[PDB]
Motif scaffolding. Structure first.
Motif, PDB file in Angstrom:
ATOM      1  N   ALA A  64      39.794  39.113  42.400  1.00  0.00           N
ATOM      2  CA  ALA A  64      38.459  38.916  41.818  1.00  0.00           C
ATOM      3  C   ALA A  64      38.049  40.118  40.960  1.00  0.00           C
ATOM      4  CB  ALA A  64      37.551  38.785  43.004  1.00  0.00           C
ATOM      5  N   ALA A  65      38.142  41.257  41.621  1.00  0.00           N
ATOM      6  CA  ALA A  65      37.789  42.531  41.064  1.00  0.00           C
ATOM      7  C   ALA A  65      38.722  42.802  39.891  1.00  0.00           C
ATOM      8  CB  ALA A  65      37.890  43.541  42.193  1.00  0.00           C
ATOM      9  N   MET A  66      40.024  42.571  40.028  1.00  0.00           N
ATOM     10  CA  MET A  66      40.880  42.924  38.905  1.00  0.00           C
ATOM     11  C   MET A  66      40.597  41.985  37.743  1.00  0.00           C
ATOM     12  SD  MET A  66      42.404  45.527  39.738  1.00  0.00           S
ATOM     13  CE  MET A  66      41.132  46.034  40.878  1.00  0.00           C
TER      14      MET A  66
ATOM     15  N   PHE D 162      31.942  33.794  48.653  1.00  0.00           N
ATOM     16  CA  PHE D 162      32.466  33.479  47.340  1.00  0.00           C
ATOM     17  C   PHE D 162      33.543  34.481  46.923  1.00  0.00           C
ATOM     18  CE2 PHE D 162      31.910  33.213  42.642  1.00  0.00           C
ATOM     19  CZ  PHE D 162      32.464  31.963  42.540  1.00  0.00           C
ATOM     20  N   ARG D 163      33.335  35.777  47.231  1.00  0.00           N
ATOM     21  CA  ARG D 163      34.230  36.832  46.778  1.00  0.00           C
ATOM     22  C   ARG D 163      35.662  36.599  47.286  1.00  0.00           C
ATOM     23  NH1 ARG D 163      32.648  39.828  49.503  1.00  0.00           N
ATOM     24  NH2 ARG D 163      34.477  40.539  50.702  1.00  0.00           N
ATOM     25  N   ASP D 164      35.777  36.151  48.545  1.00  0.00           N
ATOM     26  CA  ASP D 164      37.079  35.922  49.160  1.00  0.00           C
ATOM     27  C   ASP D 164      37.804  34.740  48.532  1.00  0.00           C
ATOM     28  OD1 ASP D 164      37.050  38.332  50.483  1.00  0.00           O
ATOM     29  OD2 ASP D 164      36.088  37.419  52.288  1.00  0.00           O
ATOM     30  N   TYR D 165      37.058  33.696  48.192  1.00  0.00           N
ATOM     31  CA  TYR D 165      37.595  32.526  47.519  1.00  0.00           C
ATOM     32  C   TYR D 165      38.128  32.973  46.151  1.00  0.00           C
ATOM     33  CZ  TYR D 165      37.272  28.327  44.667  1.00  0.00           C
ATOM     34  OH  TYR D 165      37.583  27.303  43.831  1.00  0.00           O
ATOM     35  N   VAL D 166      37.342  33.786  45.444  1.00  0.00           N
ATOM     36  CA  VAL D 166      37.815  34.222  44.147  1.00  0.00           C
ATOM     37  C   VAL D 166      39.103  35.026  44.342  1.00  0.00           C
ATOM     38  CG1 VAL D 166      37.185  35.201  41.939  1.00  0.00           C
ATOM     39  CG2 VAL D 166      35.426  34.203  43.342  1.00  0.00           C
ATOM     40  N   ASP D 167      39.171  35.860  45.387  1.00  0.00           N
ATOM     41  CA  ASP D 167      40.373  36.613  45.684  1.00  0.00           C
ATOM     42  C   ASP D 167      41.608  35.723  45.887  1.00  0.00           C
ATOM     43  OD1 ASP D 167      39.641  39.276  45.447  1.00  0.00           O
ATOM     44  OD2 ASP D 167      38.901  39.348  47.597  1.00  0.00           O
ATOM     45  N   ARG D 168      41.509  34.625  46.656  1.00  0.00           N
ATOM     46  CA  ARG D 168      42.642  33.715  46.828  1.00  0.00           C
ATOM     47  C   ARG D 168      43.052  33.053  45.508  1.00  0.00           C
ATOM     48  NH1 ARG D 168      40.194  29.386  50.319  1.00  0.00           N
ATOM     49  NH2 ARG D 168      42.363  28.570  50.345  1.00  0.00           N
ATOM     50  N   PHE D 169      42.051  32.570  44.756  1.00  0.00           N
ATOM     51  CA  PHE D 169      42.286  31.721  43.613  1.00  0.00           C
ATOM     52  C   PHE D 169      43.062  32.504  42.563  1.00  0.00           C
ATOM     53  CE2 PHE D 169      41.079  28.267  40.858  1.00  0.00           C
ATOM     54  CZ  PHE D 169      41.213  28.817  39.597  1.00  0.00           C
ATOM     55  N   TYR D 170      42.612  33.717  42.265  1.00  0.00           N
ATOM     56  CA  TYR D 170      43.320  34.458  41.232  1.00  0.00           C
ATOM     57  C   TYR D 170      44.650  34.981  41.724  1.00  0.00           C
ATOM     58  CZ  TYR D 170      39.650  34.196  37.736  1.00  0.00           C
ATOM     59  OH  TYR D 170      38.770  33.757  36.790  1.00  0.00           O
ATOM     60  N   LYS D 171      44.774  35.179  43.031  1.00  0.00           N
ATOM     61  CA  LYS D 171      46.063  35.621  43.548  1.00  0.00           C
ATOM     62  C   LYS D 171      47.096  34.528  43.272  1.00  0.00           C
ATOM     63  CE  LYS D 171      47.613  36.776  48.006  1.00  0.00           C
ATOM     64  NZ  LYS D 171      49.096  36.840  48.068  1.00  0.00           N
ATOM     65  N   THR D 172      46.706  33.279  43.575  1.00  0.00           N
ATOM     66  CA  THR D 172      47.559  32.111  43.413  1.00  0.00           C
ATOM     67  C   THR D 172      47.813  31.884  41.943  1.00  0.00           C
ATOM     68  OG1 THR D 172      46.765  31.161  45.393  1.00  0.00           O
ATOM     69  CG2 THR D 172      47.881  29.699  43.963  1.00  0.00           C
ATOM     70  N   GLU D 213      31.178  38.331  36.877  1.00  0.00           N
ATOM     71  CA  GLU D 213      30.222  39.221  37.534  1.00  0.00           C
ATOM     72  C   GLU D 213      28.917  38.469  37.798  1.00  0.00           C
ATOM     73  OE1 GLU D 213      28.686  43.403  36.048  1.00  0.00           O
ATOM     74  OE2 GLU D 213      29.434  43.841  38.116  1.00  0.00           O
ATOM     75  N   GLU D 214      28.417  37.710  36.812  1.00  0.00           N
ATOM     76  CA  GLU D 214      27.218  36.897  36.967  1.00  0.00           C
ATOM     77  C   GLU D 214      27.409  35.928  38.122  1.00  0.00           C
ATOM     78  OE1 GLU D 214      26.127  37.783  32.739  1.00  0.00           O
ATOM     79  OE2 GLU D 214      26.481  35.617  32.807  1.00  0.00           O
ATOM     80  N   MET D 215      28.542  35.225  38.121  1.00  0.00           N
ATOM     81  CA  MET D 215      28.817  34.299  39.198  1.00  0.00           C
ATOM     82  C   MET D 215      28.857  34.962  40.578  1.00  0.00           C
ATOM     83  SD  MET D 215      31.572  32.596  36.819  1.00  0.00           S
ATOM     84  CE  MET D 215      32.224  31.257  37.818  1.00  0.00           C
ATOM     85  N   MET D 216      29.567  36.090  40.701  1.00  0.00           N
ATOM     86  CA  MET D 216      29.683  36.710  42.015  1.00  0.00           C
ATOM     87  C   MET D 216      28.336  37.231  42.480  1.00  0.00           C
ATOM     88  SD  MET D 216      33.438  38.391  41.709  1.00  0.00           S
ATOM     89  CE  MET D 216      33.783  38.860  43.398  1.00  0.00           C
ATOM     90  N   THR D 217      27.586  37.813  41.543  1.00  0.00           N
ATOM     91  CA  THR D 217      26.237  38.296  41.796  1.00  0.00           C
ATOM     92  C   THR D 217      25.373  37.120  42.243  1.00  0.00           C
ATOM     93  OG1 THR D 217      26.083  40.432  40.787  1.00  0.00           O
ATOM     94  CG2 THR D 217      24.227  38.990  40.417  1.00  0.00           C
TER      95      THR D 217
END
Ligand SMILES: [Cl-]
Ligand SMILES: [Cl-]
Ligand SMILES: [Cl-]
Ligand SMILES: [Cl-]
Ligand SMILES: [Cl-]
Ligand SMILES: [Cl-]
Ligand SMILES: [Cl-]
Ligand SMILES: [Cl-]
Ligand SMILES: [Cl-]
Ligand SMILES: [Cl-]
Ligand SMILES: [Cl-]
Ligand SMILES: [Cl-]
Ligand SMILES: [Cl-]
Ligand SMILES: [Cl-]
Ligand SMILES: [Cl-]
Ligand SMILES: [Cl-]
Ligand SMILES: [Cl-]
Ligand SMILES: [Cl-]
Ligand SMILES: [Cl-]
Ligand SMILES: [Cl-]
Ligand SMILES: [Cl-]
Ligand SMILES: [Cl-]
Ligand SMILES: [Cl-]
Ligand SMILES: [Cl-]
Ligand SMILES: [Cl-]
Ligand SMILES: [Cl-]
Ligand SMILES: [Cl-]
Ligand SMILES: [Cl-]
Ligand SMILES: [Cl-]
Ligand SMILES: [Cl-]
Lengths: 222, 222, 222, 222, 222, 222
Positions: A64-66, D162-172, D213-217
């Motif tokens: 996310a961050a990256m 939400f932050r964790d979901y974004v973390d999985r999605f971009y990892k994949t 950033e807007e979305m995560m915020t």
């Protein structure tokens, strides 16, 4: 990196394992803490965009961050391009092409080219430093968003040794979005406004102008 | 750093990871102990203000303490400025600008510029050493404030082997604010004034002038 | 350090972290054992007084011992000064000043100056080696005082394999204050005088002149 | 490697142990994760095919995967050969031979020869970079095949910050085979299409164009 | 060390910490095993007697053994002196003095002087290699004396896989005092003379001339 | 090693501790696995026979195996000697002697001499690479003999994910004695001949010509 001199033999050396590995471990352990950013700069000294790209790509997780960092860098690139309007012209032999946003983010350029801009002829374009600035900006954003809390909620506990309260307050301060003037303002006002009543008193008893050492010394005995 | 010679090829090399990491670990473990300060100097050999700023920024925690250091450095900067009064003049081509307090604290200057002052032309301004001195001053202040106790409360225990008492006393001494003359005074007077009665005796039995080795040898057998 | 050559490019390089850290760990673990002293020399190769001061300052604890070292170095300095009588004269341009005791202990001199004495013009003053000698002297003193026991109390146990007895005896020997001639004397006389009766016998059965290998081989079978 | 300059002294240095060992440990621990690939490039900076061959051979295990890499490299070699048609001619003295697919994969060439192509005369053939590109291609293939899952199955959990979901999605996402345009498409469409209903809502409430950033915020408070 | 060339810039570099520390750890762990000796040589490459003295002094414990080494080196020194008869003459300006036994053991000479002998003028005296040879001799002696057992007592066990027996036998062989011819003799004769009856048979069934690989292959299936 | 250039300053540097230690640890842990051999080469880059001898001698244990290596190297030496017939002639001043088998195995030659052959005059003899080839040959032999099993016994288990079977098969393949043509043959024939019936089927359903990626993709779903 590109190692400096004012008469010595300059060199293009790629990131070392020591450096690389250090960076992975800082991100791996410290997550998104303000010191990470000075570490980044420290490890990036004299780095070219390829080096910078290298350090950023090698992070696993925090995707996310990256991604926010990529967005931020993209915006910096667009701004660079608006102000730096490209020419419709043939780069003549004996000239190097002007760099665009993406070449500086290292995506659209060669190590050679990046090497050249920083060396040039007479006019020097430090794409490494420029790009480094874009990356620190995005990292600032990220550190802010990952700051667990607001500076206004730093309140000294009833049995809290003044020193520990000061430790929390400035830690939280480092992670705020605000400018120097705001930080100045928050320092005076909120440090004494948020201290515990026992102390809040003694600090008032030094008036409105006293150094941090005076204050800590003042509040040493409970 | 900037690596020395008296005929060799000089170089501007940034802080290494080995150095950087060492520094983080010393602060991380040792907190605010006097040896930290010699370690700092040791790791900072030949450092420029950027290097110095780098080492200081990368500390996480001790944010109270890292703020007192900023205050102290600010005061040193102001003093530098009062004595070094700036000119209203155009820096002509073929000249380097005079550095102000903030340029020396590295905040208002470039690596280039810092690199130049230390090299110069004929007149050399070692901003790294100057700034390093400001930082050690603030670190001294901090070590003092974080010294758990006063030298006057170092009393040899009834069953305390003289050697261990000497170990505490000088440890505490290193962390005091006092000058050489005061340390001399405290050495004679307070070492024998605070020893246990069994020893206090034997040391008196060597008169008022005997080396530390003589004393320890003297008190070896209880 | 200052790295040597007989035609190469000489350099002034400050103590590395690897070196620095090594030294802290040796003191940290080994306390005051004779090997510490060769380690010190080993790590100090080509060191200038600043380097030496650096290594000594970075020790934390053993403050009694680190104070005896200061006393010893002071005495060496005084001796240097008596023999080297200072001139009342202006150091003319094109000359370097003569070093006094304190300049050699690095306290009263600059790295530049120390760098110069070791390089000089025609007449070389190796202040690093001189000072290093003072420090090893004080370290010898300290190792002696911290030696747990006297060489005369090294007696081979009834079931003690000769090899182990020899291991204790020479270990204790290394920590004694005595000169070469005394060590020679103690070797012959006391090694066989203090061995257990079973062995004491066989060693006498080789007469008064036989190598250590002969003796150990001799006493191999109990 | 071959260390760069634009006036300095170039050198052929073989892979260091630090580098070598780093690589073994990354493969040993991380298996087949996308960061491995940037690590590979990072460690391979300025590498020649021998260096590349060295890094690849030293992997133990993952022998299926290391075989797919050989197949891929073989295909790249064949393509290089079709386009680069070899001459029936004597390489005259004062010429270097043209490289074929296998010489570039380092199998059919000497370090000397590889060293020469990268240096040449006027026309430079960077066989290291060429081969490096073949290897990254095969590594991409391998990372894809070893990606545990499809990007379309990344769904934000009911209690998932939400932050964790974004973390999985971009990892994949990083491990998918698709191009930039497809990734762009999947970003907008599938990030909001797959979010949990609580969030899916708020993100729709920012319209079709808003930064990450807007979305995560936006989704910060549950 | 003194780093070599056949046109490059020669240098006198002292032992590194990496090297130093390595040596301490090998002795610390491995005691007196044959590999220690190749390690010693390996770490000592290009070393001068000071370097050699450094490595030897830094060992703590094994003081019996470190004393036998001194005896051995003394004897080598005496032999050197008998054959190299010293002159009664003034070393004239423009000459370097001839080295005696003790100067080569590094005890009676300076680094400068040692540096000079290895460089010289036309006639080169490699005191480092000479001394290194004396030290390896004493180390051989010591390894022999510390070898737990005689080669003649290496007998293959009834259920002992031939490979393991060969592993013991050659390990013990490396620690014997004997020359090449004796080792040759012991190889043929005693390897098959000491094998277990099951194997002793099959090896006889290959006649008197077969390689070690043939034998191990032969005895693979019990 | 001897560090390369095509215009730079060449150097004779001995094996580093990092390198040395790495090698000991690989042998210590990995025993006799195929990757050991590429590691050996990797660590040996640019090595001279002395360096090679150094790496080999420092192994402790595996004395059977280290003896087979000596036998193998001896045979290579004999072959070199038959083909390279020595001259009965005086090496005239201005010439270097021709190397024999033993000089190349480093046993009968000096570092100087080895250094010279690799440099020479016009005709270069790379004794390091030659010897390195002999050593890899013996290491191949040893890896083969220490391979636990035959390639023909690699059979995919009933519940064995195709990927794991491929991992075993190629691992075992790397340790076989056979040539490229045999490996090609075994690849097609035996990979599908030894797969489990569920898979054996699907692979037949791709005909006789399909890539490894196709096969693994094919057998992904059980
Ligand atoms: Cl590393
Ligand atoms: Cl990437
Ligand atoms: Cl406080
Ligand atoms: Cl702040
Ligand atoms: Cl406080
Ligand atoms: Cl590190
Ligand atoms: Cl910061
Ligand atoms: Cl005591
Ligand atoms: Cl003190
Ligand atoms: Cl004592
Ligand atoms: Cl370190
Ligand atoms: Cl200090
Ligand atoms: Cl014994
Ligand atoms: Cl002794
Ligand atoms: Cl013994
Ligand atoms: Cl390593
Ligand atoms: Cl291989
Ligand atoms: Cl969130
Ligand atoms: Cl992506
Ligand atoms: Cl967030
Ligand atoms: Cl170390
Ligand atoms: Cl010693
Ligand atoms: Cl066997
Ligand atoms: Cl042997
Ligand atoms: Cl076997
Ligand atoms: Cl090491
Ligand atoms: Cl050996
Ligand atoms: Cl599979
Ligand atoms: Cl294979
Ligand atoms: Cl798969």
């Amino acid at each position: 990196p590109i190692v400096q001199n004012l008469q010595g033999q300059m060199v293009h050396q790629a990131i070392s394992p020591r450096t690389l590995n250090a960076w992975v471990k800082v991100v791996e352990e410290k997550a998104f803490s303000p010191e990470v950013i000075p570490m980044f700069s420290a490890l990036s000294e004299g780095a070219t965009p390829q080096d910078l790209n290298t350090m950023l790509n090698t992070v696993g997780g925090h995707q996310a961050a990256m991604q926010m960092l990529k967005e931020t860098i993209n915006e910096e690139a667009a701004e660079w391009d608006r102000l730096h309007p490209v020419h419709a012209g043939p780069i003549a032999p004996g000239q190097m092409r002007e760099p665009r946003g993406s070449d500086i983010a290292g995506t659209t350029s060669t190590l050679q080219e990046q090497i050249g801009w920083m060396t040039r002829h007479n006019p020097p374009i430090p794409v490494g430093e420029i790009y480094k600035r874009w990356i620190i900006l995005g990292l600032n954003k990220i550190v802010r968003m990952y700051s667990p809390t607001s500076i206004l909620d730093i309140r000294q506990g009833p049995k809290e040794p003044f020193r520990d309260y000061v430790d929390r307050f400035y830690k939280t301060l480092r992670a705020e979005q605000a400018s120097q003037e705001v930080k100045n303002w928050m320092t005076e006002t909120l440090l004494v406004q948020n201290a515990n009543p026992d102390c809040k008193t003694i600090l008032k008893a030094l008036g409105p102008g006293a150094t941090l050492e005076e204050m800590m010394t003042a509040c040493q005995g409970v």
